[PDB]
């Protein structure tokens, strides 16, 4: 008995199957992250990714920024997080402009790990990525606003 | 088989390892909320102009209207000027 | 670094990094549109010379002016 097996039974594809790669917990959890929901409108997946990251980014900027000890304005350091979301929404935007063209189809795989044919994820399409950037921006600024909305009764505010 | 000149996506491993392909877990109403309020942001060209100009004007506002209580560069020197090694 | 270490080491290192990106979830949704390669041998000599010269000029300009203007004499 052995634990490490070739990637999907093919030894000549550059990868391996390990508990980190191929495991029911890892496979399910990654299959349930919004970036891997290959049948959902990319606008909504962008909303979730934007909400999670915009919410997370507020913490470090507020607690480590220059105005951190000047409590008069340190709570407004979420603006820096919001500015990074703006910058990242530009990085996301300019990425799709160069990667996918208007009439180009999806570059995502049109297969399944079991061989059956599949409908490619619309995220690797020009309009799909545009919806994801718009969703990430909307959820991003919403995540920063909602994170700054909370401030009190926390051990590290 | 693993080598099939017909389908090279299966031959070269062009698979979706962690794609779910399941229907949406996001219920309705909520999705329509985001699909109508995040609608104008999904034009990548318009979003690019909106981000650059909007972000640049936001940066210009908070920089032009800065405060001496927040930035030492605007507060300026509060002490009398020093004296150079020989000159002023 | 650009003048002592040479290319082939960094090319094999970039190959091990390209495999890492293609096999990492979430990030593999982002594809590079230009293949990552190590800097050319002539490019390495130029980049190393430019860092050498910039450091040369800036180090001495800093010492020159600070040691002279600090005394002004």
């Amino acid at each position: 008995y052995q634990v490490v097996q070739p990637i999907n039974g093919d030894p000549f594809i550059g990868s391996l199957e390990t508990p980190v790669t191929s495991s029911p917990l890892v496979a399910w959890y990654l299959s349930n992250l919004p970036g891997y929901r290959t049948a959902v409108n990319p606008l909504l997946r962008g909303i979730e990714v934007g909400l999670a990251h915009g919410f997370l980014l507020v913490g470090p900027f507020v607690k480590a920024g220059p105005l951190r000890n000047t409590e008069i304005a340190g709570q407004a350091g979420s603006l820096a997080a919001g500015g990074l979301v703006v910058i990242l929404s530009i990085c996301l935007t300019i990425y799709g402009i160069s990667s996918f063209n208007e009439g180009d189809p999806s570059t995502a795989p049109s297969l399944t790990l079991t061989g059956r044919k599949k409908q490619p994820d619309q995220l690797q399409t020009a309009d799909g990525w545009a919806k994801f950037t718009g969703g990430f921006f909307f959820g991003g600024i919403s995540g920063v606003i909602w994170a700054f909305f909370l401030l009190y009764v926390l051990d590290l505010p | 088989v693993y080598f099939d000149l017909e389908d090279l996506g299966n031959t070269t491993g062009q698979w979706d390892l962690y794609g779910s392909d399941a229907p949406s877990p996001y219920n309705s109403l909520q999705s329509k909320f985001f699909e109508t309020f995040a609608a104008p942001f999904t034009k990548r060209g318009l979003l690019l102009k909106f981000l650059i100009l909007g972000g640049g004007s936001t940066l210009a506002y908070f920089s032009a209207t800065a405060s001496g209580d927040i930035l030492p560069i605007k507060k300026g020197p509060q002490l009398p000027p020093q004296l150079g090694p020989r000159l002023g | 670094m650009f003048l002592i270490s040479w290319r082939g080491y960094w090319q094999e290192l970039i190959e091990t990094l390209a495999w890492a990106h293609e096999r990492t979830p979430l990030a593999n949704l982002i594809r590079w549109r230009d293949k990552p390669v190590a800097l050319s041998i002539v490019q390495a000599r130029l980049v190393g010379l430019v860092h050498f010269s910039v450091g040369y000029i800036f180090t001495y300009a800093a010492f020159l002016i600070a040691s002279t203007s600090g005394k002004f004499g």
Binding site: I94, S98 | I52, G56, L59, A60, A64, K74 | D34
Partner: peptide, 30 residues
């Protein structure tokens, strides 16, 4: 007051627009 407008306009906005536009031109195809 003018530095408070032009210093970010050349150290933040200008490199942002310049790097993004050069990225689009370099990665463009015909």
């Amino acid at each position: 007051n003018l530095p408070s407008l032009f210093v970010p306009l050349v150290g933040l906005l200008f490199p942002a627009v310049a790097m993004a536009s050069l990225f689009l031109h370099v990665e463009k195809r015909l």
